[PDB]
Amino acid sequence: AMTVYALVVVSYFLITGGIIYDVIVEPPSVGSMTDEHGHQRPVAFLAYRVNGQYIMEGLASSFLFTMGGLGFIILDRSNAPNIPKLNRFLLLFIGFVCVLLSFFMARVFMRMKLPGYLMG
């Protein structure tokens, strides 16, 4: 059934996110040492070592991934057929899903560049 697909996409970001860092769990975001004045500002996603993450890093990554895929699901399931409201609902659907697609890929590109320092 399609509920099995629901189960799998549920499992998707669940084991993209943090099952690897369930036992190696590293707490969410604080690592600044006063930087000049202000003591313990929580920093970010980890950047210097590549393999590590925190809980807050992983969840964000997983969320970015499944929304993109299910945006393509929405492109398939409704935008290619022609049955519903042919000027109001459809245009919304392609609009927000194209927004999903473009801004999602853009921000994930940003969230690999800034933790990664890769030449873009």
Partner: peptide, 29 residues
């Protein structure tokens, strides 16, 4: 809302908050 600027107006307000929040935090660390 004959016009959509009221929304855009709200977005401008958030940006003013958004940008002006980190804008003073620029000189700090």
């Amino acid at each position: 809302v004959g016009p959509v600027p009221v929304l855009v107006m709200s977005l401008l307000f958030i940006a003013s908050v958004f940008m002006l929040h980190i804008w003073g935090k620029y000189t700090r660390s």
